[PDB]
Nucleic acid binder design. Structure first.
Lengths: 144, 87, 217, 185
RNA sequence: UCGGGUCUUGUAAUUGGAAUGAGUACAAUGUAAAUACCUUAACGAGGAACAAUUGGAGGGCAAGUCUGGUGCCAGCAGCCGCGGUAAUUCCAGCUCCAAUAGCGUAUAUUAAAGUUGUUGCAGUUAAAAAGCUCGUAGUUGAACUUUGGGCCCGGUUGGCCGG
RNA sequence: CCACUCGGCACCUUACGAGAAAUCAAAGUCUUUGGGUUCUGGGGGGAGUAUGGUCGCAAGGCUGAAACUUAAAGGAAUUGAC
């Protein structure tokens, strides 16, 4: 009878079977082990601030050849070194080194076929300033 | 099926089978309708008066329509000493 | 002027059959779409899909077109037809024709009470094609059609006003889905209910009442 | 630390955002009735949804039950008071065939135009929001007033408004003052 | 045939007379005192600026068969991705679309998910029947032990009435 | 040898029915979803690897991860072009 017990005094076997088989999910296992509270670089938050250590010319080769513009940051809350993408600025003229940056998440899945990376994070603010309004020229950036 | 006014609201009443009493649907082409001619005292067939039977595609396809039509005929007095109810 | 070739067709041309309910009543095989066109004058088609398919025919890479077409009355007479042809418009037209041939009726019924016209279906039904299973459940009045827009359009070409749907399987491949929904709406005249337990006498065909007419000379 | 004051939402976001037949039907409703937002349609959809849920969960109970007859008569009478449901249709079955246009026709928005007090539906909304229209004695300037049936023989112009009463407005007497000064000049 | 009126469009930064609050404010109301609201004298728009934005226009998914630059920072970037004088897909302009005082993004959750399945998954070959058997806890466990008949009582709907 | 009856290992048709298909008298009686009960799986790698426990003289066995990485990896069937 469908390989599972159907007796009317068998609720215990059913719920122990569910608690054993829910560890095969992905979100459950990340969620009840405290994965984000231990090893994820944001520590389970939606944003983070950090200090720019480097500007990086990452390369995406195949099948799209592009020069990815990234930034190696050291986060303030953790002491954690994270590279992150910065959009829409070909010059990175709003970014210098040793500036403070508000980062968010970024869902690009890079490919394995040509060693192209998808870094996990985008730049939202530099030096307190909205990077969008910089690139759309609605504010000016204080340069320290 | 009718409405609250008591008038019928269907497109058509389906023909039911006779061997298994199930519905002969609008596309059962393996089913069959049988006419058997009413005879005269001289043994002449009456032209426009038949006894009808309905033998559905499941019945006919399974390989049963002969025996079932024998049963229906002897129970309607068209055969005798053919279909035995005990086997 | 259309000349028939079938004795059903020259019955239909003679004005000796009025509705398709005789043909639906007698389980007849139709082979002339002109019968359907003369008996459903308010039959309104709609294309569901036209798609170029690349053939490899005797060293020739060519482009044909698969046309999935649904015809359907605003009352309960539905038809499905799928046709591959060399041209777009020829595939359209012959898919219309194949949908004219495979017209089946539906039994749309009530949910709950008995007022006015039947709006929903009469029971639950289920169709399957490929791995696509489509389950139809009756719905209260004015609840619309809870269905994906292909299936929803095939149901709007039936005069089905209210139905809940659930599917299962890979419903990406839309021709399996339309075939499964078409089987589900064909099986509604296939489930025996207690209000049709009443024994009915078997009526005669038009083939024998009108046997002296409509014979090949 | 007080009573946490209650509130609710009133519209409902549709499930799929881009659906050509729905966009066309909503825009036909807006054109026939002079709306401004899709949210003004979604409000009526949400209210009709709650009414249909109340109806179809009272239908499952058998008749001659006091809860069904009580709440059904309350609902039906309340719909008849605003003229959304008609006189003959006073059953629970006919409130489910009741559609959105039946609600949307019963607005002050609509009833100003339909009584021949405005030239346009847009002109009707304008005469509403510029405080020209009274129901009995109280002036209403929300187009979503949803006129109850008994309130139909009271919609007129206000005694405040220049169309219905007291002195002509700002532009009128301004132009009259310029005419009188220029005739004096 | 002309032209006789009924509509309904489109424009013409063409013209006309209207309506009114945003805002300012005598006063009055308000309030412990005020501020604000509801009222209200007196001002207050052709509104070429009392200027509506946010994201898009390959497909999913509504919207370009448009122009220029790019094509050494560029076939590009939730997913799939498609020419390089000639791009519906980069940048800009025009045009169009969606919701609109609100729209987008990140994180989490829920739905979609019948991908946690009691309802309601799957286990020949797609992931997965322990190498086989014994066996404790656990789960599950054949049929049978007053039927049938008769009496009276009074209810709560429906008809045949309406008294 | 003939006829019947149990209890087997296998065969060969069909399809009523199932399945994505090859096929299946069970892999049927399953959306019209419930006879009882045991075990197992939740995209692919990383990896049956690391660590701990236990069994063994040893070889090893049982139990058994995460970080990280990625848009496919697959199963069946179908055609003809080097």
């Amino acid at each position: 009878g469908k390989g599972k017990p159907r007796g009317l005094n068998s609720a215990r076997k059913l719920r122990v079977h569910r608690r054993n088989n829910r560890w095969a999910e992905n979100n459950y296992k990340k969620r009840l082990l405290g994965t984000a509270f231990k090893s994820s670089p944001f520590g389970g938050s939606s944003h983070a601030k950090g200090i720019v250590l480097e500007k990086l010319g990452i390369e995406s080769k195949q099948p799209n050849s592009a020069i990815r513009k990234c930034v190696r940051v050291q986060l303030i809350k953790n002491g954690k070194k994270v590279t992150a993408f910065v959009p829409n600025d070909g010059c990175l003229n709003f970014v210098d080194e040793n500036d403070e940056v508000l980062l968010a998440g970024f869902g690009r899945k890079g490919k394995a076929k040509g060693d192209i990376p998808g870094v996990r994070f985008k730049v939202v603010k530099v030096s307190g300033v909205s990077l969008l309004a910089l690139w759309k020229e609605k504010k000016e950036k204080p340069r320290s | 099926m009718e409405n609250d006014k008591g008038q019928l609201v269907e497109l058509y009443v389906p023909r039911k089978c006779s061997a298994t009493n199930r519905i002969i649907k609008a596309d059962d082409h393996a089913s069959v309708q049988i006419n058997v001619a009413k005879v005269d005292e001289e043994g002449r067939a009456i032209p426009g008066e038949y006894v009808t039977y309905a033998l559905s595609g499941y019945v006919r396809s399974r390989g049963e329509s002969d025996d079932s039509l024998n049963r229906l005929a002897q129970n309607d007095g068209l055969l005798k000493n053919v279909w035995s109810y005990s086997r | 002027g259309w000349v028939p070739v079938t004795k059903l067709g020259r019955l239909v041309k003679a004005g000796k059959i009025t509705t398709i309910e005789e043909i639906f009543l007698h389980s007849l095989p139709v082979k002339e779409f002109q019968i359907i066109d003369t008996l459903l004058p308010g039959l309104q088609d709609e294309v569901m899909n036209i798609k170029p398919v690349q053939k490899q025919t005797r060293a020739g890479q060519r482009t044909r077109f698969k046309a999935v077409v649904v015809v359907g009355d605003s009352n309960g007479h539905v038809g499905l037809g799928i046709k591959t042809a060399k041209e777009v418009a020829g595939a359209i037209r012959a898919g219309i024709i194949i949908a004219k041939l495979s017209v089946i009726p539906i039994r749309r019924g009530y949910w709950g009470t008995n007022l006015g016209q039947p709006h929903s279906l009469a029971t639950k039904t289920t169709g399957k094609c490929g791995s696509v299973t489509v389950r139809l459940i009756p719905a209260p009045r004015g609840s619309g059609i809870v269905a994906s827009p292909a299936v929803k359009k095939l149901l709007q070409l039936a005069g089905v006003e209210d139905v809940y749907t659930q599917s299962n399987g890979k419903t990406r491949t839309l021709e399996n889905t339309l075939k499964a929904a078409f089987v589900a709406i064909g099986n509604t005249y296939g489930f025996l209910t207690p209000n049709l337990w009443a024994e009915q006498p078997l009526p005669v065909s038009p083939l024998d009442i009108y046997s002296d007419e409509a014979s090949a000379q | 630390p007080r009573a946490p004051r209650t509130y609710s939402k009133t519209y409902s976001t549709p499930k799929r955002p881009y659906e050509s037949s729905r966009l066309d039907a909503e825009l036909k409703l807006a054109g026939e009735f002079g709306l401004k937002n899709k949210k003004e349609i979604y409000r009526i959809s949400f209210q009709l949804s709650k009414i249909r849920r109340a109806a179809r969960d009272l239908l499952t109970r058998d008749e001659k039950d006091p809860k069904r007859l009580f709440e059904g008569n309350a609902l039906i009478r309340r719909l008849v008071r605003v003229g959304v449901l008609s006189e003959d249709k006073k059953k629970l079955d006919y409130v489910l065939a009741l559609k959105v246009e039946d609600f949307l026709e019963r607005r002050l928005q609509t009833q100003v135009y339909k009584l021949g007090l405005a030239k346009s539906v847009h002109h009707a909304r304008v005469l509403i929001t510029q405080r020209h229209i009274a129901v009995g004695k109280q002036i209403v300037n929300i187009p979503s007033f949803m006129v109850r049936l008994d309130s139909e023989k009271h919609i007129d112009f206000a005694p405040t408004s220049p169309f219905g009463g007291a002195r002509p407005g700002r532009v009128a007497r301004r132009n009259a003052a310029r005419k009188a000064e220029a005739s004096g000049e």
